[PDB]
Amino acid sequence: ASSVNELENWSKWMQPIPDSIPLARISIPGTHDSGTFKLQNPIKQVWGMTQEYDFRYQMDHGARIFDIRGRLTDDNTIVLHHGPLYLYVTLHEFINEAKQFLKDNPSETIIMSLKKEYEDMKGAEDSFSSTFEKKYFVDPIFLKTEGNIKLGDARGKIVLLKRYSGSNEPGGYNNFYWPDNETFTTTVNQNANVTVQDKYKVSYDEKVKSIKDTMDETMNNSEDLNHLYINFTSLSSGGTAWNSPYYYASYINPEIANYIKQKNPARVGWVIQSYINEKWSPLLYQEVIRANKSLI
């Protein structure tokens, strides 16, 4: 909690950050459609795959925010989906990976975004929200405290970012507006504000400008601890060819990695990327973590 060299430890990078820092102010790497790593079917993967490695690999690479999309099944369980595609991964499977990681690295915390991706199965007993809260959320690893959550209250726990309607259990970040395919601003709570850049399905040129534009706003608003900045660098279009999330990401990641590197900002916000790996040159996630040196 003193050396900047400690941010270079991908599994324990949150250790140096002061306990009093709200998670909002922290620059955190995230993964888009985190549970698509099992899609190995050639045609399914050219449209649905946004990750090639599992949850643990992702976390061991500094990722601390996970984009979870679920669906209520007959068996009254929540499984992971990408549209109408069952990903061969379950919500329990994710929560268990998160627990092991937090057991080994108690200094860390993981933010889980939960969204209803597909319509509930016909024979379901309860609704998506009630099912998730009665069977999962009730688990102790879930932080039940709200407001502008500090890193201290989050260590060893899973912080929930609600992207589902109809919640009845307090805890984490409340659900807000979130319009389709665009960048917007709203409020989470009385003591918080949100700016999200979620322009999936858009031109590469418009996409890159969007990311950078949102990243400039957070750079110049670095000391505003009451403002949440979520920046999705992922881009999806017509697959089958080099228009896949992998193709765009092979350019977008190093590009934004450099952008962050050159500017040397004190805050870049929460950056949710596709294909977290070690292939691309400057490494986006690593640069994002480094921008936290100002907090050390």
Coordinates of C-alpha atoms in Angstrom, one line a residue:
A1 CA 0.0 0.0 0.0
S2 CA 3.0 2.3 -0.7
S3 CA 4.9 1.1 -3.7
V4 CA 3.6 1.9 -7.2
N5 CA 5.3 -1.3 -8.3
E6 CA 2.5 -3.2 -6.5
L7 CA 0.1 -2.2 -9.4
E8 CA 2.2 -4.5 -11.6
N9 CA 0.8 -7.6 -9.6
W10 CA -2.3 -8.4 -11.7
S11 CA -3.8 -10.7 -9.1
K12 CA -3.4 -8.3 -6.2
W13 CA -3.3 -4.8 -7.9
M14 CA -6.1 -3.4 -5.6
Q15 CA -4.0 -4.0 -2.5
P16 CA -2.1 -0.6 -2.7
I17 CA -5.2 1.5 -3.2
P18 CA -6.5 3.3 0.0
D19 CA -9.5 1.7 1.7
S20 CA -11.3 5.1 1.6
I21 CA -11.3 5.4 -2.2
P22 CA -14.8 5.0 -3.7
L23 CA -14.7 2.3 -6.4
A24 CA -16.0 5.0 -8.8
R25 CA -12.7 6.9 -8.8
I26 CA -10.6 3.8 -9.4
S27 CA -9.7 2.9 -13.0
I28 CA -10.8 -0.7 -13.5
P29 CA -10.4 -3.1 -16.3
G30 CA -13.5 -5.1 -17.2
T31 CA -14.6 -7.8 -19.7
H32 CA -17.5 -7.6 -22.1
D33 CA -19.9 -10.7 -22.3
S34 CA -17.4 -12.5 -20.0
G35 CA -18.9 -15.9 -20.3
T36 CA -18.5 -16.5 -24.0
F37 CA -15.1 -18.3 -23.7
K38 CA -16.7 -21.8 -24.2
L39 CA -18.1 -21.0 -27.7
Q40 CA -15.8 -23.1 -29.8
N41 CA -18.4 -23.8 -32.6
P42 CA -16.9 -21.9 -35.7
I43 CA -20.2 -20.2 -36.7
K44 CA -21.4 -19.5 -33.1
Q45 CA -18.0 -17.9 -32.2
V46 CA -17.9 -15.5 -35.2
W47 CA -21.0 -13.8 -33.9
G48 CA -21.2 -14.5 -30.2
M49 CA -17.6 -14.9 -28.8
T50 CA -16.0 -11.9 -27.1
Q51 CA -13.5 -13.7 -24.9
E52 CA -11.2 -16.7 -25.4
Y53 CA -10.2 -17.4 -21.8
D54 CA -12.1 -18.3 -18.6
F55 CA -13.1 -16.2 -15.6
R56 CA -9.9 -17.0 -13.6
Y57 CA -7.6 -16.1 -16.4
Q58 CA -9.5 -12.9 -16.8
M59 CA -9.2 -12.0 -13.1
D60 CA -5.5 -13.0 -13.0
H61 CA -5.0 -10.4 -15.7
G62 CA -6.4 -7.6 -13.5
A63 CA -10.0 -7.7 -14.7
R64 CA -12.3 -6.8 -11.8
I65 CA -15.6 -6.1 -13.6
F66 CA -17.7 -8.8 -15.2
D67 CA -20.4 -8.4 -17.8
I68 CA -22.9 -11.1 -16.8
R69 CA -25.9 -11.8 -19.0
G70 CA -28.3 -14.5 -17.7
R71 CA -31.5 -16.4 -18.4
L72 CA -34.1 -18.1 -16.1
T73 CA -34.4 -21.8 -17.0
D74 CA -37.1 -24.5 -16.2
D75 CA -34.9 -25.9 -13.5
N76 CA -35.2 -22.5 -11.8
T77 CA -31.5 -21.7 -12.3
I78 CA -29.9 -18.7 -14.1
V79 CA -27.6 -19.6 -16.9
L80 CA -25.4 -17.5 -19.2
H81 CA -26.8 -16.4 -22.6
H82 CA -25.7 -14.3 -25.6
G83 CA -29.1 -13.5 -27.1
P84 CA -30.8 -16.8 -27.7
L85 CA -27.6 -18.7 -27.3
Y86 CA -26.9 -20.8 -24.2
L87 CA -23.2 -20.3 -23.4
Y88 CA -22.6 -23.5 -21.6
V89 CA -21.8 -21.6 -18.4
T90 CA -24.0 -20.9 -15.3
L91 CA -24.3 -18.2 -12.8
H92 CA -23.1 -20.6 -10.0
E93 CA -20.1 -21.4 -12.1
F94 CA -19.1 -17.7 -12.1
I95 CA -19.8 -17.0 -8.4
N96 CA -17.6 -20.0 -7.5
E97 CA -14.7 -18.8 -9.6
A98 CA -15.1 -15.4 -8.0
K99 CA -15.0 -16.9 -4.5
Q100 CA -11.8 -18.9 -5.1
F101 CA -10.0 -15.8 -6.5
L102 CA -11.2 -13.7 -3.5
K103 CA -10.1 -16.5 -1.2
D104 CA -6.6 -16.4 -2.7
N105 CA -6.5 -12.6 -3.1
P106 CA -8.6 -11.2 -0.2
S107 CA -7.3 -7.7 -1.1
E108 CA -9.4 -7.6 -4.2
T109 CA -13.1 -7.2 -5.0
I110 CA -15.1 -8.1 -8.1
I111 CA -18.0 -6.1 -9.6
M112 CA -20.6 -8.2 -11.2
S113 CA -23.0 -6.6 -13.7
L114 CA -26.2 -8.7 -14.0
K115 CA -28.5 -8.3 -17.0
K116 CA -31.5 -10.4 -18.2
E117 CA -30.3 -11.4 -21.7
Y118 CA -33.2 -13.6 -22.8
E119 CA -36.8 -14.3 -21.9
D120 CA -37.5 -16.7 -19.1
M121 CA -38.3 -20.3 -20.0
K122 CA -42.0 -21.2 -20.1
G123 CA -42.0 -23.5 -17.0
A124 CA -40.2 -21.0 -14.7
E125 CA -41.7 -20.7 -11.2
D126 CA -40.5 -17.3 -10.3
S127 CA -39.3 -14.2 -12.1
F128 CA -35.7 -13.5 -13.0
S129 CA -35.1 -10.9 -10.3
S130 CA -36.8 -12.8 -7.4
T131 CA -35.1 -16.0 -8.5
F132 CA -31.6 -14.3 -8.5
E133 CA -32.2 -12.7 -5.1
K134 CA -33.7 -15.6 -3.2
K135 CA -31.3 -18.2 -4.5
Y136 CA -28.0 -16.3 -5.2
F137 CA -27.8 -12.7 -3.9
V138 CA -28.7 -13.9 -0.4
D139 CA -25.2 -15.5 -0.3
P140 CA -22.8 -13.7 2.1
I141 CA -20.1 -12.8 -0.5
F142 CA -22.5 -10.3 -1.9
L143 CA -22.0 -6.8 -0.4
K144 CA -25.4 -5.5 0.8
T145 CA -24.2 -2.0 1.4
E146 CA -25.2 0.8 -1.0
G147 CA -24.3 4.4 -1.8
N148 CA -20.9 5.4 -3.1
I149 CA -19.2 2.1 -2.1
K150 CA -15.6 2.4 -0.8
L151 CA -12.9 -0.1 -1.7
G152 CA -12.6 -1.0 1.9
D153 CA -16.1 -2.2 2.4
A154 CA -15.8 -4.2 -0.9
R155 CA -12.6 -6.2 -0.2
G156 CA -13.3 -10.0 -0.3
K157 CA -16.9 -9.4 -1.5
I158 CA -18.6 -9.3 -4.8
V159 CA -20.2 -5.9 -5.7
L160 CA -23.3 -6.1 -7.7
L161 CA -24.2 -3.7 -10.6
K162 CA -27.9 -4.2 -11.3
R163 CA -29.0 -4.2 -14.9
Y164 CA -32.3 -5.9 -14.2
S165 CA -35.6 -4.4 -13.1
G166 CA -37.8 -5.4 -10.1
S167 CA -35.2 -5.7 -7.4
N168 CA -36.3 -5.9 -3.7
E169 CA -33.0 -6.6 -1.9
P170 CA -30.7 -3.7 -1.1
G171 CA -27.0 -3.9 -2.1
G172 CA -24.6 -2.7 -4.7
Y173 CA -25.3 -0.2 -7.5
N174 CA -29.0 0.3 -8.3
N175 CA -30.4 -0.1 -11.7
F176 CA -30.7 3.0 -13.9
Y177 CA -32.1 4.0 -17.4
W178 CA -29.4 2.7 -19.8
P179 CA -30.8 3.4 -23.4
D180 CA -29.8 1.2 -26.3
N181 CA -26.6 1.8 -28.3
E182 CA -25.3 5.2 -27.2
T183 CA -23.4 7.2 -24.6
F184 CA -25.5 8.8 -21.9
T185 CA -25.6 10.2 -18.3
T186 CA -27.9 9.5 -15.3
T187 CA -27.8 9.0 -11.6
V188 CA -27.3 5.8 -9.6
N189 CA -28.2 7.3 -6.2
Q190 CA -28.5 10.6 -4.4
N191 CA -24.7 10.6 -4.0
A192 CA -23.7 9.4 -7.5
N193 CA -23.8 10.0 -11.2
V194 CA -23.1 7.8 -14.2
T195 CA -21.7 8.3 -17.7
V196 CA -21.7 5.3 -19.9
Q197 CA -20.4 4.9 -23.4
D198 CA -22.2 1.8 -24.8
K199 CA -22.1 2.2 -28.6
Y200 CA -22.0 -1.4 -29.7
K201 CA -23.0 -1.8 -33.4
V202 CA -21.5 1.4 -34.8
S203 CA -18.7 2.3 -37.3
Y204 CA -15.1 1.8 -36.2
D205 CA -14.4 5.5 -36.7
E206 CA -17.4 6.6 -34.6
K207 CA -16.5 3.9 -32.0
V208 CA -12.9 5.0 -31.5
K209 CA -13.9 8.7 -31.2
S210 CA -16.6 7.7 -28.7
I211 CA -14.2 5.9 -26.5
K212 CA -11.6 8.7 -26.6
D213 CA -14.2 11.4 -26.1
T214 CA -15.6 9.7 -23.0
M215 CA -12.0 9.0 -21.8
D216 CA -11.1 12.7 -22.1
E217 CA -14.1 13.7 -20.1
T218 CA -13.1 11.3 -17.2
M219 CA -9.5 12.5 -17.5
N220 CA -10.4 16.1 -16.9
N221 CA -13.0 15.1 -14.2
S222 CA -10.5 12.9 -12.3
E223 CA -11.2 14.4 -8.9
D224 CA -15.0 13.9 -9.1
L225 CA -15.4 10.8 -6.8
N226 CA -19.2 10.9 -7.1
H227 CA -19.1 10.2 -10.8
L228 CA -19.1 6.8 -12.5
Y229 CA -17.6 6.4 -15.9
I230 CA -18.1 3.2 -17.8
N231 CA -16.4 2.9 -21.2
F232 CA -17.1 -0.1 -23.4
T233 CA -14.4 -0.5 -26.0
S234 CA -16.2 -3.6 -27.5
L235 CA -17.7 -3.4 -31.0
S236 CA -20.0 -5.9 -32.7
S237 CA -21.2 -6.0 -36.3
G238 CA -21.8 -8.4 -39.1
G239 CA -19.7 -11.5 -38.4
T240 CA -18.9 -14.3 -40.8
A241 CA -15.9 -12.2 -41.9
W242 CA -13.4 -9.8 -40.5
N243 CA -16.0 -7.7 -38.8
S244 CA -16.1 -9.9 -35.8
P245 CA -15.4 -8.6 -32.3
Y246 CA -12.0 -10.1 -32.5
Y247 CA -11.0 -8.1 -35.6
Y248 CA -12.2 -4.8 -34.2
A249 CA -10.6 -5.6 -30.8
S250 CA -7.2 -6.5 -32.4
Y251 CA -7.0 -2.8 -33.4
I252 CA -9.1 -1.1 -30.8
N253 CA -7.2 -2.5 -27.7
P254 CA -3.6 -1.5 -28.6
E255 CA -5.0 1.8 -30.0
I256 CA -6.7 2.8 -26.7
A257 CA -3.8 1.2 -24.8
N258 CA -1.5 3.7 -26.5
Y259 CA -3.9 6.6 -26.1
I260 CA -3.9 6.1 -22.3
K261 CA -0.1 5.6 -22.3
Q262 CA 0.6 8.9 -24.2
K263 CA -1.7 11.1 -22.1
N264 CA -0.6 9.7 -18.7
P265 CA -3.9 10.5 -17.1
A266 CA -4.8 10.3 -13.4
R267 CA -8.2 8.7 -14.2
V268 CA -9.6 6.7 -17.2
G269 CA -12.7 5.2 -15.6
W270 CA -14.1 1.7 -15.9
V271 CA -12.9 0.2 -19.2
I272 CA -14.8 -2.9 -20.3
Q273 CA -13.0 -4.6 -23.2
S274 CA -13.4 -7.6 -25.5
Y275 CA -10.7 -10.3 -25.9
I276 CA -8.6 -9.8 -22.8
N277 CA -5.3 -11.6 -23.6
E278 CA -1.6 -11.2 -24.1
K279 CA -1.5 -10.9 -27.9
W280 CA -1.9 -7.2 -28.5
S281 CA 1.0 -4.8 -28.1
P282 CA 0.6 -2.2 -25.3
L283 CA -2.1 -4.2 -23.3
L284 CA -5.2 -2.1 -22.5
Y285 CA -6.0 -3.7 -19.1
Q286 CA -2.4 -3.1 -17.8
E287 CA -2.4 0.6 -18.9
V288 CA -5.8 1.0 -17.2
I289 CA -4.5 -0.4 -13.9
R290 CA -1.4 1.8 -14.1
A291 CA -3.5 5.0 -14.3
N292 CA -4.2 4.4 -10.6
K293 CA -0.6 5.4 -9.6
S294 CA -2.1 8.7 -8.6
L295 CA -4.1 7.0 -5.9
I296 CA -1.1 5.2 -4.3

